[PDB]
Amino acid sequence: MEQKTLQVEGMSCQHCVKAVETSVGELDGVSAVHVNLEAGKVDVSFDADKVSVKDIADAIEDQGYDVAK
């Protein structure tokens, strides 16, 4: 169970950020996630054996935002 601060560009709407939190949440592995709209940050916590950042990032880019690598 790790905790990471993904750097995210492009998030600007409090309503739409709700969907970020929701899709990264529906990922097995994901024990929690909280989107910090103003820091462009998606601090996440999870089971590193059950999901990867790659998916998580992938689930973040499918909303259309940019995950810094």
Per CB under 8 A, residues contacting a second copy are 10-19, 63-65
Establish if 13 lies at the interface with Cu ion (CB under 5 A). Answer: yes
Least Cβ distance, residue 61 to Cu ion (angstroms): 15
Report d(CA 31, CA 63) in Å as an integer: 20
What tokens does 12 get? 């600007």
Is 27 labelled as part of a ligand binding site?
Answer: no
Strands 41-46 vs 66-67: parallel, antiparallel or unpaired: unpaired
Alpha carbon distance 66, 69 (integer Å): 8
CB 9 to a second copy: min, Å: 8
Tell me which residues touch Cu ion (CB under 5 A).
13, 15-16
